[PDB]
Symmetry: none
Subunit: 30 residues, 4 copies
């Protein structure tokens, strides 16, 4: 319920973190 | 105490991250 | 558990976000 | 054991943020 929504936010946070890592890798590269 | 509070905190953290991500994408373009 | 422990992690996360905010301002600076 | 699991997920997110913060500071 609320627990399932928490898991959805946790997963969405991980997606943003990965996005950030990929932006940083591009920045370092160029 | 409540799972809804944690959920809300996580949603706010996810938005923060999204903003960081966008800011970094902008840096990547310079 | 626990609730108290979850609160501390959240607080720690928020502070790292603030440090990141700091670094981003400096890069723009 | 959901609370403990959430706590652990948060700790890992915390550590990733610190690593991102260190990388950021290294930019240029």
């Amino acid at each position: 319920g609320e627990l399932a929504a928490i898991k959805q936010e946790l997963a969405a946070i991980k997606k943003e973190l990965a996005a950030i890592k990929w932006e940083l890798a591009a920045i370092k590269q160029g």
